Design a protein around this motif. Structure first.
Motif, PDB file in Angstrom:
ATOM      1  N   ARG B 244       0.843  -1.188   0.000  1.00 22.82           N
ATOM      2  CA  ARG B 244       0.000   0.000   0.000  1.00 22.82           C
ATOM      3  C   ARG B 244       0.888   1.253   0.000  1.00 22.82           C
ATOM      4  O   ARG B 244       2.073   1.186   0.329  1.00 22.82           O
ATOM      5  N   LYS B 247       3.732   7.644   2.503  1.00 24.60           N
ATOM      6  CA  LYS B 247       4.070   9.046   2.319  1.00 24.60           C
ATOM      7  C   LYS B 247       5.496   9.159   1.803  1.00 24.60           C
ATOM      8  O   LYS B 247       6.390   8.451   2.258  1.00 24.60           O
ATOM      9  N   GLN B 250       7.999   9.886   4.414  1.00 29.25           N
ATOM     10  CA  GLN B 250       8.324   8.741   5.252  1.00 29.25           C
ATOM     11  C   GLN B 250       9.195   7.732   4.506  1.00 29.25           C
ATOM     12  O   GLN B 250      10.120   7.141   5.090  1.00 29.25           O
ATOM     13  N   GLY B 253      12.699   8.875   4.836  1.00 26.90           N
ATOM     14  CA  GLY B 253      13.297   8.613   6.136  1.00 26.90           C
ATOM     15  C   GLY B 253      13.747   7.176   6.163  1.00 26.90           C
ATOM     16  O   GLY B 253      14.836   6.837   6.629  1.00 26.90           O
ATOM     17  N   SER B 254      12.884   6.324   5.633  1.00 25.31           N
ATOM     18  CA  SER B 254      13.174   4.912   5.494  1.00 25.31           C
ATOM     19  C   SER B 254      14.442   4.669   4.640  1.00 25.31           C
ATOM     20  O   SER B 254      15.291   3.848   5.006  1.00 25.31           O
ATOM     21  N   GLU B 257      17.567   5.491   6.568  1.00 26.03           N
ATOM     22  CA  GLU B 257      17.882   4.440   7.547  1.00 26.03           C
ATOM     23  C   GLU B 257      18.360   3.108   6.936  1.00 26.03           C
ATOM     24  O   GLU B 257      19.394   2.569   7.335  1.00 26.03           O
ATOM     25  N   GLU B 265      17.473  15.619   3.500  1.00 25.75           N
ATOM     26  CA  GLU B 265      16.362  14.825   3.018  1.00 25.75           C
ATOM     27  C   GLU B 265      15.570  15.554   1.932  1.00 25.75           C
ATOM     28  O   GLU B 265      14.775  14.939   1.238  1.00 25.75           O
ATOM     29  N   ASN B 604      18.290 -29.934  11.154  1.00 29.52           N
ATOM     30  CA  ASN B 604      17.123 -29.178  11.582  1.00 29.52           C
ATOM     31  C   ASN B 604      16.035 -29.115  10.511  1.00 29.52           C
ATOM     32  O   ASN B 604      14.853 -29.058  10.834  1.00 29.52           O
ATOM     33  N   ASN B 608      12.740 -30.028  12.397  1.00 32.10           N
ATOM     34  CA  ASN B 608      11.852 -28.880  12.593  1.00 32.10           C
ATOM     35  C   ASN B 608      10.514 -29.089  11.908  1.00 32.10           C
ATOM     36  O   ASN B 608       9.609 -28.281  12.068  1.00 32.10           O
ATOM     37  N   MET B 609      10.388 -30.139  11.104  1.00 37.70           N
ATOM     38  CA  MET B 609       9.088 -30.415  10.501  1.00 37.70           C
ATOM     39  C   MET B 609       8.082 -30.645  11.627  1.00 37.70           C
ATOM     40  O   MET B 609       8.428 -31.177  12.671  1.00 37.70           O
ATOM     41  N   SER B 610       6.845 -30.213  11.424  1.00 40.33           N
ATOM     42  CA  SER B 610       5.818 -30.405  12.428  1.00 40.33           C
ATOM     43  C   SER B 610       5.333 -31.868  12.452  1.00 40.33           C
ATOM     44  O   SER B 610       5.545 -32.627  11.503  1.00 40.33           O
ATOM     45  N   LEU B 611       4.683 -32.251  13.547  1.00 35.64           N
ATOM     46  CA  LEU B 611       4.114 -33.585  13.696  1.00 35.64           C
ATOM     47  C   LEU B 611       3.055 -33.854  12.628  1.00 35.64           C
ATOM     48  O   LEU B 611       2.847 -34.999  12.215  1.00 35.64           O
ATOM     49  N   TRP B 612       2.386 -32.801  12.179  1.00 39.54           N
ATOM     50  CA  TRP B 612       1.467 -32.917  11.050  1.00 39.54           C
ATOM     51  C   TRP B 612       2.115 -33.630   9.859  1.00 39.54           C
ATOM     52  O   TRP B 612       1.441 -34.337   9.118  1.00 39.54           O
ATOM     53  N   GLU B 617      -2.430 -36.862   4.547  1.00 41.48           N
ATOM     54  CA  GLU B 617      -2.476 -35.808   3.553  1.00 41.48           C
ATOM     55  C   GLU B 617      -1.113 -35.128   3.409  1.00 41.48           C
ATOM     56  O   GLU B 617      -0.730 -34.726   2.313  1.00 41.48           O
ATOM     57  N   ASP B 666      -7.911   6.025 -17.623  1.00 40.71           N
ATOM     58  CA  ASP B 666      -8.070   6.890 -16.448  1.00 40.71           C
ATOM     59  C   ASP B 666      -8.105   8.379 -16.806  1.00 40.71           C
ATOM     60  O   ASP B 666      -7.607   8.797 -17.854  1.00 40.71           O
TER      61      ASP B 666
END
Ligand code: MG
Ligand code: MG
Ligand code: MG
Ligand code: MG
Ligand code: MG
Ligand code: MG
Ligand code: MG
Lengths: 670, 666
Positions: B244, B247, B250, B253-254, B257, B265, B604, B608-612, B617, B666
């Motif tokens: 989205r 400004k 802003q 400023g970003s 940094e 600026e 890992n 680190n895989m889940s029990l699911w 499936e 437009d």
DNA sequence: AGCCGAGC
DNA sequence: TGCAGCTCGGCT
DNA sequence: AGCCGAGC
DNA sequence: TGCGCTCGGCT
């Protein structure tokens, strides 16, 4: 007639000519609005429409001094552009022949400040030329590039005419703008707030001045109070609160440019005002020179101003940095966020209606504000003293009386009577030709004292010379004078002669209470007590919340542990199981749907908290670790249940004081 | 006014007084802080706004009207044409020396240089006395005064020649050689290794750093068409990945940094606005969207609203032109341990040609007109077929006029004017970069009204512009129109300008300043570099996909061995479990291994895989993913670098068609 | 003479 | 990039 | 005559 | 909140 030296004016082609009275002067809220007006007007509208931008709020001329009026560039500009003359009556059609425009059309934002500017303009015309108001001289253009050209195409539908109907109009304008009608304004707004409070327990081409005042302007007057008068609960106004909410949300671990914080505040908390105001708010929150904040919640990383100029010497917001003080979350504990009523600005969740600090911050940093009808002023009070009074009240004792106290102030504050204090700097005789000044009363700034007191003394002269040895944070004047004059000065009060005593009187401690009702408080003791009862009640709420949440977490861990133990024992298996069968089996075996999730909703079955665990969970170390965490969670809820809300409060106070000691020691070393 | 005159200035102690000229008001303050109270007697403090007028060859009106230089003159007590050879002359000065206090940086050095230039031009005699000194970089600096104070020394004619080298409008070719030597010499050490000050040393050892740094920030790269500030802006937008609008203020400023942008600026915000502009004569493809008033062709963009009130975000074309995958091939720079923007991006067509890269440095400047994106895509496709690119004329999006080659790198750019009837002509296009309001004020108004030096030509005119189009209807007498036709309607109405492009100067991919004679040369150099980066991309993809394939293979294997009871982890210690995985020949994280190579065993990615992962499936999902990835490796393997480029070209054109039709609607 | 734009 | 006109009430 | 500060 | 200069090529 034309108009020479008014660069920002876009004069109507026909202005000052035969068609003067058919010409309209559009006064706009700021230069940007002027551009929109110019664009919507096109080349054709350039004939009968002039455009001139106002900076913002204009002089209230009703009781301003003659000097302030005669010297006001904006007001003189308007007079020149329109051709007005002080003291002239515009009753005839004859008298009207001397004007370059026949009407003024006000074009502001359709917000409360917009309305205030309309009122100030109305006030200016009403005060000087009431006769004009009877000819329908004032109009306005209401709004919700292309849209601009469309608004003006449909010019008439956006055009409202102010109408004078009778002496009720005079009374309404006077009520809003006369310095003599403060009491009336209090009553005016007291009825408005109550009337609105009631409604909330349930559910024209021509606008008269009376209706404008009582239905539109009053909305500004109320919002002015709502933004300018602090809450008793957290000592904040909404703007400041948005700042803190944003800092908490961002949780920066390193410094951040003030301008970017501000941008972040506007984005994250739905702050709808100019960025000058917001950056000043932020600077103010960070200041820490003598006479500012006892506890600055934001850190002044850079030049945020000094006692030399009362902070007016702050570098600009693009070159200075800030972040939260380590004291901020100690004073406003994160867990308590769970108890707040967070506000919504159009589907965005923004700042809370108030924070609930562990001590009454409204006393700590000098809550101060000017609204309409009311103003608020509180002096600073000592944090530790306040901590001690909360402790006293927690033990059912009586809170000691408190005197204002300003961090690092070396002078004296003496109570004269209820809410009346004498504040004294420090001056001592060094020898027969020399006094030394080492402190100025609070809020007397070094440069101002130099200019307004010492200079006049030096140039009937009273002193022979003076020298300065100030630091950024301390005051030291050495003053020479003749034995005779010192003896005389000394015979009269030295503090008196050198203007080192000022009175501080606090008979307007006006605050919003926890229900958002405006209230006058007679003593800080009343403020403390009211804070204390609410805060104690909220430690009660914190304990209930924590017992519930920690309980859900304990249940969660129990189920996770049970599952792991059964898995490693062979008691249960999931390998190659359908998801449906797996859910069904867990249900039948009495596993519980996410307890924490269920508890939050309480303020199909969900076993993700179990099945999302990693395969690592089935291993030795992790099995042991899970069991320990389950048991610790059990003890945690148990220990909490045994404690009182008072105990929790005391824990916070001690944690706060310990860090306050560290922080303040570091500042004296630095 | 902004002046803090020294107490003794003007008096008998004049010549012992120092005027401190600071870079900006803020610096002034730190000077007043570090000075008082004792310092206030013999030191004045006055702030310069920034760069000062170069008076060496400035016009008399310009010099006489310069507020800043007049203020300095009055403060010092200077007088034009007065020689200062003896001691009877030095008596009229209110200050005995000027102390320049700037940033310890290149722009600070430029201001030093311009002040020196000022004194040297007007009062060379003052330099022989040691009039100028500098303060190097607060109450502590001033206490350690002499250790921070450096005095400039006039040493001989070689000092004159150096100041003149730097600041005379007549020494451009000399500056080119001056800087050429510098760039070559620094390029030499880049392969190897690493109080009084003569004006010759200041110029040749300090100012020259500004002059070179001025080129590096002002003259774009051939590779991506960006200068470093612009590049920092795109880098930050890519990293933020905003969905989205934000400004502009802003975003700036970003950028400061996230990309270590070290400048005011204001410049940054103007850069952002410039990147978003999309009116005729600006960007053929704006990489940032102008959400708000970013300026129009009415005022050539000067009508943009404040950055405080305007928004932007990436165009959808941005990442089509600069594919994310290529980020992996770039060389990202470091500014104090922070990884910041790359030396260059590597877009899919030569962006330097598309949006008309231009800039003014020292010694050189760059100017390229806009070229048509589709023509360029076509030429790229031709070169991929082994054919020669067609020659290209400059082309400006939405421009309705004509651009015709007159000579080499020289073009006639013409608007549109047509006779309607014997009293009427209609103007429907102005030459590129002619703004509507300027044309109205400098051409039609004078034609309507006459001037002191010209007669009226027309009887009337009306405007029917929209925000993006030009329409003037002009009335004339039959006689006047006939005359105008005879002389050339376009000529009479100032609807033809010349476009000359003999200064196509760019940094090449090695970072060497280069002059290109034709755009075909730029296109070709760009083409070779981009083709070989599609080579690098393929190598990178084969590696990365390969590792991901091996990864999935190992995860799939473990899940199958587990649901088959061939392997158990239940209640095994970490050490026993790892040792076991090694012995069954499971591979340490292949993807991490791969990224490691590109410049204990780690399992890992499996555990680190889940029990699911053990459920029905999920086993099926994991197998599909493994198999799909295997096919992915092969699909990519069958593609040549040139195939990859062609897919990118196609995806880009499709979105360009969609984007530009949305714009017309437009 | 003044534009172009990244800087002060 | 550093400015600073005004409002509004209490207080001086 | 003017500070305090959140606003235009 | 809006608000004079450099440097090179060219018009
Ligand atoms: Mg508004
Ligand atoms: Mg305060
Ligand atoms: Mg600098
Ligand atoms: Mg361009
Ligand atoms: Mg007042
Ligand atoms: Mg330059
Ligand atoms: Mg020039």
């Amino acid at each position: 007639s034309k108009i020479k030296g008014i660069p920002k004016l876009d004069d109507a082609n026909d202005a000052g000519g035969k068609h003067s009275l058919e010409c309209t002067l559009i006064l706009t809220e700021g230069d940007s609005a002027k551009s929109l007006a110019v664009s919507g007007l096109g080349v054709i509208g350039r004939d009968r429409y002039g455009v001139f931008p106002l900076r913002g709020k204009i002089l209230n001329v009703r009781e301003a001094s003659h000097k302030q009026i005669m010297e006001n560039a904006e007001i003189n500009n308007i007079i020149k552009i329109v051709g007005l003359q002080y003291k002239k009556s515009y009753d005839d059609a004859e008298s009207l022949k001397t004007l370059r425009y026949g009407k003024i059309m006000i074009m502001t934002d359709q917000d409360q400040d917009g309305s205030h500017i309309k009122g100030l303009l109305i006030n200016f015309i009403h005060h000087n030329w009431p006769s004009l108001l009877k000819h329908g001289f004032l109009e306005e253009f209401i709004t919700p590039a292309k849209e601009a050209k469309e608004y003006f195409a449909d010019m008439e539908r956006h055009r409202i005419l102010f109408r004078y109907a009778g002496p009720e109009d005079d009374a309404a304008i006077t009520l809003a703008f006369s310095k003599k009608k403060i009491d009336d304004r209090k009553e005016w707004l007291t009825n408005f707030m109550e009337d609105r409070r009631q409604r909330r327990l349930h559910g024209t081409k021509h606008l008269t001045y009376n209706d404008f005042i009582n239905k539109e302007l009053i909305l500004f007057s109320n919002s002015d109070n709502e933004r300018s008068i602090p809450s008793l609960v957290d000592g904040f106004k909404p703007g400041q609160r948005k700042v803190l909410f944003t800092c908490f949300k961002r949780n920066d671990k390193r410094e951040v440019k003030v301008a970017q914080l501000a941008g972040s505040v506007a984005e994250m908390s739905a702050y709808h005002h100019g960025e000058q105001a917001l950056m000043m708010t932020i600077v103010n929150l960070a200041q820490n020179f003598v006479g500012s904040n006892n506890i600055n919640l934001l850190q002044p990383i850079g030049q945020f101003g000094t006692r030399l100029h009362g902070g007016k010497d702050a570098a600009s917001p693009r070159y200075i940095f800030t972040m939260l003080s380590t004291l901020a979350r100690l004073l406003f504990p994160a867990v308590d966020d769970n108890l707040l009523k967070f506000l919504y600005d159009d589907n965005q969740r923004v700042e809370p209606e108030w924070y609930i600090p562990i001590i009454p911050m409204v006393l700590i940093n000098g809550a101060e504000g000017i609204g309409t009808g009311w103003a608020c002023k509180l002096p600073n009070y000592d944090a530790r003293e306040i901590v001690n009074n909360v402790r006293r009240m927690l033990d059912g004792l009586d809170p000691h009386p408190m005197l204002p106290n300003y961090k690092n102030f070396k002078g004296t504050i003496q109570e004269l009577g209820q809410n009346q204090y004498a504040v004294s700097g420090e001056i001592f005789v060094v020898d027969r030709n020399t006094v030394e000044i080492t402190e100025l009363p609070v809020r007397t700034w070094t440069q101002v004292y130099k200019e307004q007191v010492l200079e006049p003394m030096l140039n009937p002269a009273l002193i022979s010379d003076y020298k300065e040895y100030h630091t950024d944070t301390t005051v030291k004047f050495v003053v020479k004078m003749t034995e005779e004059k010192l003896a005389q000065a000394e015979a009269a009060g030295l503090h008196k002669v050198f203007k080192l005593q000022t009175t501080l009187t606090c008979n307007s401690m006006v605050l919003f209470d926890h229900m958002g009702c405006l209230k006058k408080y007679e003593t800080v003791q009343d403020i403390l007590k009211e804070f204390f009862d609410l805060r104690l009640s909220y430690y009660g709420l914190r304990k209930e919340w924590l017992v519930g949440m920690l309980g859900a977490e304990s249940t969660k861990l129990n189920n996770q542990a049970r599952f792991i133990l059964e898995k490693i024992q062979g008691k249960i298996t999931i390998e190659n199981r359908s998801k449906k069968d797996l859910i069904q089996m867990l249900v039948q075996r009495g596993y519980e749907s996410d307890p924490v999730k269920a508890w939050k909703e309480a303020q199909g079955p969900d076993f993700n908290y179990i099945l999302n665990m990693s395969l690592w969970s089935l291993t030795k170390e992790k099995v042991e670790e899970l069991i320990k965490q389950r048991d610790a969670k059990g003890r945690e809820v148990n220990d909490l249940k045994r404690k009182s809300p008072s105990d929790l409060w005391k824990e916070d106070l001690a944690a706060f004081v310990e860090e306050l000691d560290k922080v303040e020691s570091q500042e004296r070393e630095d």
